[PDB]
Symmetry: C3
Subunit: 495 residues, 3 copies
């Protein structure tokens, strides 16, 4: 019932890179068509972008958006999505068994990222294409002018280069369900050679090597080791993907899965440092966690849609509707991301609009709304800039059906120096027993105490109203005392 | 003089897949140009197809035709053969040192297949092209509309999709004489990935993985093992190729060669089942015998042509003129195919027109006529539909120069119970002795004994007449007693 | 003081293939643009070709020129350089951080080679491209007509096929500074299948497989053995690359480096013979030394030009200005090449115009002069055609900072039978002592003794004048030719 945590400014983990509050838009389902892009809608601007969605994205303070995939990119031909729209083909999207009409391509999606105050992180097709097509796309986007592909961008109506900073070398290609599956050795080579050439066009870019499609793949983490062995000198990040689900309907074990996330991350870091010692390099590889979220609700509808009604434009795929308990895990996942901010410098919640997303528009042009997971992310991105202090914590333990010694209270604190504030994120993942956390600030004024709680752990949000929303609700010597209700998300700020 | 055999509808082998009576047209020599396609000719229809050639193919009841190669496909660019004929290029055909004019492409050959009531088995180029080109060709042929390459087919004048059922992942590429020669691991990888992508576009197709170019390559049968190991989950067949020759002028040892055919088939079946165990699959790989024939007569003239008269259109290559003994061995090969109809589901006489073919057009628009090998195939395709019955047979044996204990009488019975007939196929390949076949027919009337025989084992057919052709030449109890002339082919039907 | 040589016309090494006097033009720096190709210029002809440069090349009697690279070729798309010039794109040259405007492509460069009496040895892109693109280029260039790419050539205004004889399968691709870098097994496989398919289009061409970037690469010589293992039956040559520098500023050691060249050539020959025994083949692979020169003066200015000033048309890259001691090592390398004429059949001075070149044009459109290295190459190419006789030399030796037992004199005799000339090429690389060379022409009138010498080993040529240029002599009565060879000199002594 008690839990003691001592924060101290002097005990840093690292500065937060803001790109860990990024997200991800794939040409999948209604992410784009009847998603952020709805040409005649009364709620859209003259370019067809839903303005209410733009506003909801800006509320999440997303600085970087992965695009356009995802499994989609591994058979995408980028030239299909630029130039006059009347001349753009329709294409089969093999990954998601849909027709892609290519109304949104590089230039429309870059315009959209301007409107939501975000940058693109661009993925290139290394499934069915290779080096020279990555070079062309990079020249098109980043070279000012005076060459075949920069002048082509100019002739398409974009005089200034997009100057995309981070590029991703394909998508995860270790699974037998993706077009252009590669062995680790094949992918290591194409990534090394694509990376080599791209850095010769634009040496200021950063590059992401793709890790395994999940930690459960038998080739994890040898895949990461092999790719980094080949490409180390030319890439800056390795990517990780992780999704969690609660089909077993075990909310106690569900919220313990953040422990598996912590272990996955350290595994990837050890793998990077193993290859570091092997190359005798002084460079550190950072982590790009460019696919993470809860994902399990829509699994069976998606299987129906493929292949019952295949080859639709914008079929409603991956439309997970999230519960309060899902928001609790998304919050736990964010706490775990923060705790490893010394190595994780990029992360993308997957995905942003409609597809397993914090932001939903109702089908056929309907209204936009916030899912339960919208709010833990909004809080983390708003108050979680600054310096991650080392959580030194003793907290009660519990076991679940499949995890052991699960921390009762997961927590981290982030000192914003320019603002003299200190924000403490804490989840009580004791489903039953309320707990108090006593926090010895030895720093270094109790601003507020925002909470995400609800009676019903399976409650949902909808276009008819949010049942889950930040209750701006609930310190005086040096020790801060606030109470963590069972199954709750807590944002405690100090000034 | 005496050989005995028990026929019994309870010792089934398998139901015959009629696709074992298939054939093969490659863009080679006079197969197409000055072959089935002759636009000026008086005997040609509105599309330029020779109508007498069309009639002869239908007499063979060929249900499936492989196209368009062959070594030719390994450097073929299928876009060169579709669209307005005025804009189609002339290409160098490296395999056969010829100019391909591309007057006949997929759409013309598909129309021709309709007129001979056959359908296409399409090979894709995995020599100099790869995944995305195979996907484009499949989309073009099988996707109905609303996408780049399907709409391209429609605009080219073919509104409905061809819906090609069986595709071949390349041609054999183990030979140093083939453009795009692959190692077995290289071919396995590209076959695996091409098949994976193709089945995402059209999951109803079947795919054929290529075997060794012959049983005599050092990489047979490890090539088959390796390809199947990579691609097992996505393919349905493995291909086999076999040609026999009588360059040594030894008819006895020549006719013994279907024994090595049987052994060859067993070797490939064992290879498939070894991999099935390795995979723990419940699927059996079936065999596609998409190249088999006698071929040796024209070998020296083809050296002359490729080496000194290169880059012609329609050079007269591979124009074997077949003898009566060649027809006997073709019959022995058809019997062996029938004996393995449990695993062999597709087979292709290589080839259908002019090129090592049962059908010949003279040259420079001359008349069409039937080679000796035409009639064993016509008999087998006409009456060999139904259930292959296990041959329990005790026959005299003989030695030849290079074969030991060769059975004198080779035989199988097919039981068509929807017509209530039992057709016995038998060859006496003892050339020096006549032999009586006592056939115990555990019942279940004789309707005819049909023969191909001749005194002159080297006699040929020609445009001036057929010397080898079906003769109606000649059981009461339940015991079928049939006299099998030395070096003869026999089709004895009971009902 | 005394070195003795025995020249017998019956002790032969081999007939000299004149393609050992080849050179090389890459789309690099000012080789093409502001070099051989200058449209506006008063010195330029109807095609835009500097006529003064054309005549300078013709004096070197260069029979074959490799083109278009070099690193450049490894990401070159040849179609960008043919067809109407108004429709040719500008492209990023990742190798040299330049813009390639493609005003000179294969058909302009083929015309230029006609004007200097040379042929192209063409390199195909095996970096980012492969089999089918090499087939297309070979058909465009060598197939008469009646097919897609041969007719395309005709449509572009070249009715006759170029009929290019020697093709180079990519460029060396073992280095991490190269677009499309390959492991030895990757390159082995791609070279094998490119070669196989190309020889089906035109069986009369000859093919060069690429060796390592230099002997110093860790994968040398295993790269050469693997590529030859794969492609042996389909290729005719293996390539070698060698450059030398004098950044340590040690003239004696510098001039000893032809000894390393000799060791390098033998190592590659052994490698060929190893694979030959492995293949039980009756065919020897021949050597193509298609990059060799002195190269070091311009390294630092080159590093500055990328970055700081990247993506220019025609940046002034690799503009080494050669000293007299550089010309001596160039002469020593040509002597070494001559001594291995039985296996080296193609060699390429890298490069011909402005880019580490014997011929310079001064930048922004004039005026064109000859570097110090121009002249040993001119002598070797003009008088070094015939039979390499076997060098029997008793030369005094000397040690240097990093080399031992270095001959003071390097010499080789080339017997021309259609002229009754013998030519003795000799270098005295003892920087300190004149040496008399006694040649016993067990033969068989002294025709001349040409000399390249100077008091300043660091003196350079320039547009303002040649400081280094040929002179006579100093200076044969029985069957005994005696000739004093100066301190640090290049010597061409001719008999008739
Ligand atoms: O997040 C959506 C999909 O999940 C993963 O399988 C893919 O990378 C991505 O396309
Ligand atoms: O039947 C002709 C040729 O036989 C084999 O050589 C090839 O696969 C095929 O093109
Ligand atoms: O000679 C110029 C360069 O030297 C080597 O680096 C390359 O092969 C070539 O491009």
């Amino acid at each position: 019932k008690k839990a003691r945590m001592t924060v101290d400014k002097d005990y840093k983990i690292a500065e937060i890179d803001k790109r860990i509050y990024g997200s991800f838009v794939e040409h999948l389902g209604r992410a784009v068509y009847d998603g952020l892009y709805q040409p005649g809608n009364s709620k859209s601007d003259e370019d067809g972008f839903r303005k209410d969605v733009i506003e909801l994205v800006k509320e999440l303070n997303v600085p970087i958006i992965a695009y356009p995939g995802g499994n989609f990119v591994s058979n995408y031909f980028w030239e299909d999505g630029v130039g006059p729209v009347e001349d753009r083909p329709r294409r089969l999207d093999l990954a998601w068994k849909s027709i892609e009409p290519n109304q949104v391509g590089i230039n429309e999606f870059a315009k959209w990222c301007k409107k939501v105050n975000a940058e693109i992180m661009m993925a290139v097709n290394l499934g069915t294409r290779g080096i020279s097509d990555a070079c062309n796309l990079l020249e098109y986007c980043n070279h000012p002018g005076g060459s075949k592909y920069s002048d082509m961008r100019i002739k398409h109506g974009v005089k200034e280069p997009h100057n995309i900073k981070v590029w991703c070398l394909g998508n995860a290609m270790d699974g037998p369900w993706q077009v252009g599956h590669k062995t680790m050795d094949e992918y290591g080579r194409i990534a090394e050679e694509t990376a080599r050439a791209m850095k010769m066009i634009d040496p200021s870019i950063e590059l992401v090597a793709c890790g395994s499609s999940s930690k459960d793949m038998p080739t994890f983490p040898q895949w990461e080791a092999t790719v980094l062995d080949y490409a180390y000198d030319y890439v800056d990040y390795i990517s990780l993907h992780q999704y969690y689900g609660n089909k077993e309907n075990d909310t106690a074990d569900f919220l313990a899965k953040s422990d598996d996330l912590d272990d996955f991350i350290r595994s990837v870091i050890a793998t990077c440092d193993y290859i570091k010692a092997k190359k005798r390099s002084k460079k550190d590889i950072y982590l790009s966690f460019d696919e993470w979220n809860v994902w399990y609700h829509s699994n069976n509808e998606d299987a129906n849609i493929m292949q019952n009604e295949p080859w639709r434009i914008a079929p409603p795929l991956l439309e997970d509707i999230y519960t309060f308990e899902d928001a609790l895990l998304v919050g736990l996942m964010l706490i775990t991301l923060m705790k490893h901010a010394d190595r994780i410098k990029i992360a993308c919640l997957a995905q942003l609009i409609n597809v397993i997303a914090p932001i939903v528009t109702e089908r056929n042009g309907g209204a936009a709304w916030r899912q339960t997971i919208f709010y833990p992310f909004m809080h983390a991105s708003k108050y979680g800039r600054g310096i991650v202090l080392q959580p030194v914590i003793n907290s009660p333990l519990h076991d679940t059906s499949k995890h052991e010694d699960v921390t009762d209270i997961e927590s981290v604190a982030i000192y914003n120096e320019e603002k003299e504030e200190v924000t403490i994120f804490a989840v009580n993942r004791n489903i039953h027993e309320d707990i108090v956390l006593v926090s010895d600030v030895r720093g270094m004024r109790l601003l507020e105490h925002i909470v995400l709680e609800h009676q019903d752990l399976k409650i949902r949000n909808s276009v008819n109203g949010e049942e889950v929303y930040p209750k701006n609700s609930d310190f005086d010597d040096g020790i801060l005392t606030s109470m963590l209700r069972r199954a709750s998300w807590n944002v405690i700020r100090i000034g």
